[PDB]
């Protein structure tokens, strides 16, 4: 059926934005989406009817991402010893937000804070759904959102 494919096309832009927001290396975010698409297509029949497809897709990408970080961390620990963090985002095409600066601010956050504030503040998930994605309690997400928000305000020098 063309239906699953058409549903993906709707979520795909947000899925890519999630990967870029999550990634610590600019040139690795795009492959992350590709791998997610391939895994989601294979596991498409395990998608529970009536549930959140976007949350289902984001969960796959999130878990694949942390899997890559763990693998890369092992290769770094058994080689040179340096982790590389890189930011490379083309200037805003529509508005005036300094995307490079904002991404750098996101990277100043902890991994948990960064993901939480993206899921809640940008991806449009409920506290319930974001908690399911991160595999934690609702209270945890809320505290992570609050800490991330306050840190971003100080980082981006915005009173609000």
């Amino acid at each position: 059926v063309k239906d699953f494919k058409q549903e993906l096309l709707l979520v795909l832009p947000a899925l890519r934005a999630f990967a870029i927001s999550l990634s610590s290396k600019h040139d690795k975010a795009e492959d992350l989406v590709q791998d997610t698409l391939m895994k989601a297509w294979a596991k498409q029949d395990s998608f529970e009817m009536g549930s959140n497809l976007k949350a289902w897709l984001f969960t796959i990408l999130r878990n694949e991402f942390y899997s890559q970080m763990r693998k890369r961390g092992r290769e770094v620990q058994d080689s040179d010893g340096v982790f590389i963090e890189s930011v490379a985002i083309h200037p805003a095409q529509y508005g005036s937000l300094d995307l490079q600066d904002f991404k750098k601010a996101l990277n100043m956050l902890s991994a948990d804070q960064r993901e939480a504030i993206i899921l809640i503040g940008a991806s449009g998930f409920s506290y319930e759904d974001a908690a399911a994605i991160c595999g934690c309690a609702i209270g945890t997400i809320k505290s992570r959102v609050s800490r991330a928000r306050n840190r971003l305000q100080e980082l981006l020098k915005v009173d609000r």
Binding site: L37, L99, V158
Partner: protein
């Protein structure tokens, strides 16, 4: 309004939406779309 964690009238809530939007302004890579087509094609021959 302490229960408002994100801050509905905060600048940071707006910047988060802006960042998310600007990223999606960029073109979705053709290889990603082509992969999706190839996945559908493989299903068709099944």
């Amino acid at each position: 309004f302490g229960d408002d964690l994100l801050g509905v009238n905060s600048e940071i809530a707006r910047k988060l939406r802006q960042f998310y939007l600007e990223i999606q302004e960029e073109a979705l890579p053709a290889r990603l779309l082509e992969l999706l087509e190839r996945l559908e094609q493989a299903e068709r021959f099944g």
